[PDB]
Design a protein around this ligand. Structure first.
Ligand SMILES: [Ca+2]
Ligand SMILES: [Ca+2]
Ligand SMILES: [Ca+2]
Ligand SMILES: [Ca+2]
Ligand SMILES: [Ca+2]
Length: 311
């Protein structure tokens, strides 16, 4: 149960999509900041050979991809690779790559490909996705997949993020080699290429959990039929198989009228309009449905609404 919030023509997030080939920067070996179109890339590295504290490091660009260049590590200090190392004071830490999108930009999916990490020695790591400084999604990966020509590192779970942290995790070993061999080869920001958004609406499903705590929120879809563009064409809401967090509103000429993007971890929902609509039947809002599952599994059905742009 949630009241409609009108969409608006201002402060619309720029949506970032497209595949970015991170092997095309080797001309400058070492930058503190890589600057591509829509995002920047930084790096955090070890404070010394015997200090696991993270400090600003250089992004190291090569024909294989990007890695982090710590001045010193306790062993196997690789310049072109993101490294997890143990330190003899008895604690461990990983180098970091940081993908930071430009202000007012968001992605709803990522497909990340690494290099220098398959072919024998166990290699593992994790990608964290943040939106506004909340954790939104993690993706863990490992050279137990099926070779350097194997993606499956997908994240259309949660939609919105503005920040990726890519780091290594512990592979199990002790002092010669650990998770190192891991170099970011490409990053593809998922989503269909749309027109230019003429309106935007955002709210957050925040519901009563009770005393048994939080579990998860789910995007049911949308009941709405009879929705029409202001030119009078019928609208058909739909998902792709396996991707409950993106509803497309298409117009029966095939064109996109709106998209809804949902972020389950925070409950955030974001409405993008591309064509003016006719006043939605009955109420005047587009009603989407949610199921608020529990830590047990104790369920509760509700809804969030938004009034679209209507000439
Ligand atoms: Ca390194
Ligand atoms: Ca290694
Ligand atoms: Ca309603
Ligand atoms: Ca409605
Ligand atoms: Ca309960």
């Amino acid at each position: 149960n949630a009241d409609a919030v009108s969409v608006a023509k201002t402060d619309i997030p720029k949506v970032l999509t497209g595949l970015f080939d991170l092997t095309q920067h080797s001309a400058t070996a070492n930058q503190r900041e890589l600057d591509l179109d829509g995002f920047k890339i930084t790096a955090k590295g070890f404070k010394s050979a015997t200090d696991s504290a993270l400090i600003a490091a250089d992004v190291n660009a090569s024909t294989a991809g990007l890695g982090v260049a710590s001045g010193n590590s306790p062993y196997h200090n690789l310049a072109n690779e993101v490294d997890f190392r143990l330190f003899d004071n008895g604690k461990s830490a990983s180098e970091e790559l940081i993908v930071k999108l430009d202000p007012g930009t968001v992605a709803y999916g990522a497909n990340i490909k690494f290099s220098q990490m398959f072919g024998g020695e166990k290699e593992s790591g994790v990608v964290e996705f943040y939106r506004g400084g909340v954790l939104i999604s993690t993706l863990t990966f490992s050279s137990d997949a099926a070779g350097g020509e194997y993606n499956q590192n997908f994240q259309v779970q949660q939609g919105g993020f503005d920040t990726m942290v890519i780091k290594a995790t512990n592979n199990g070993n002790t002092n010669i080699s650990d998770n190192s061999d891991f170099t970011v080869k490409s990053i593809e920001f998922l989503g269909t290429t749309t027109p230019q958004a003429i309106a935007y609406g955002s709210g957050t499903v925040a519901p009563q959990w009770g005393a048994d705590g939080k579990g998860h929120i789910d995007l049911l879809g949308s009941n709405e039929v009879g929705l029409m563009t202001a030119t009078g064409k019928e609208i058909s809401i739909s998902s792709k198989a396996g991707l409950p967090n993106t509803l497309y509103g298409e117009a029966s000429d095939g064109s996109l009228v709106f998209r809804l993007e949902f972020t389950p971890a925070t409950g955030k929902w974001e409405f993008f309009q591309y064509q003016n609509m006719s006043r939605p039947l009955g109420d005047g809002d587009i009603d989407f449905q949610i199921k608020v599952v529990d830590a047990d599994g104790d369920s509760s059905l509700g809804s969030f609404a938004t009034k679209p742009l209507v000439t």
